Amino acid sequence: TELLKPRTLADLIRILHELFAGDEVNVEEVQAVLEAYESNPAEWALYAKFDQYRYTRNLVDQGNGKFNLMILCWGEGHGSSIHDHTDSHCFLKLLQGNLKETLFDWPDKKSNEMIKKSERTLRENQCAYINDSIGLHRVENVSHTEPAVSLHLYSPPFDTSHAFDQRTGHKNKVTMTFHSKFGIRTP
Ligand SMILES: [Cl-]
Ligand SMILES: [Fe+2]
């Protein structure tokens, strides 16, 4: 229960394994520890593998089955769908650059435009949190000049989730694909 500042990415991962040793999740503690880690680009360069056309997901740690820890690499103008998180916790920490997070409510059955609830700018080293009970979101690198890199933790792990059509609120199931795992490109 005593949270210490992670010295390095490796140290962070060790602390995370401790925090997820059990069956439940202390969200505030996990968020605090992620925020306390000061991004050091040398430590995660191995995972920072970009694609020219869309953002990439790069698996870093499998949390001994309790969580997926991954690094997402967002080119200029790259962004996500409006999506849920499959009944899992989702932590988002910025390692480089800025991302815009837009929040949406769960849609009703009637086909309507999904209206933004709010938006915020996540800045370097900040850590956001979302779950399905909170709502849906879109994450975007709106920069024209700076790539963004973020560190994501999902617990329990999931490899499918839903994308939502902003015009209708209709959803479709999407399978998550990893661009790399443990620094190895996995085509
Ligand atoms: Cl996300
Ligand atoms: Fe998300």
Cβ atoms of residues 140 and 80 within 8 Å: yes
Annotated binding site: 83, 85, 137
Dump strand ranges (E) for the chain.
56-61, 68-74, 82-83, 89-96, 99-104, 116-122, 127-130, 136-140, 148-155, 160-164, 171-175, 180-181, 184-185
Q: Entry resolution in angstroms?
A: 1.8
> Which strands form 116-122's sheet, in the order they lie side by side?
116-122, 99-104, 136-140, 82-83, 160-164, 171-175
Structural determination approach: X-ray
Annotated binding site for Fe cation: 83, 85, 137
Q: List the domains of the chain with CATH numbers.
A: 1-187 (2.60.120.10)
In angstroms, what is the span from residue 86 Cα to ligand 1's centroid?
A: 11
In angstroms, what is the span from residue 18 Cα to ligand 1's centroid?
A: 23
Instruction: Say which DSSP state 79 is in.
Output: B
For residue 57 the two structure tokens come to 């997901």
Residues forming a β-bridge with 25: none
Any idea what the Cα angle at residue 157 is, between residues 155 and 158, rounded to 5°?
A: 125
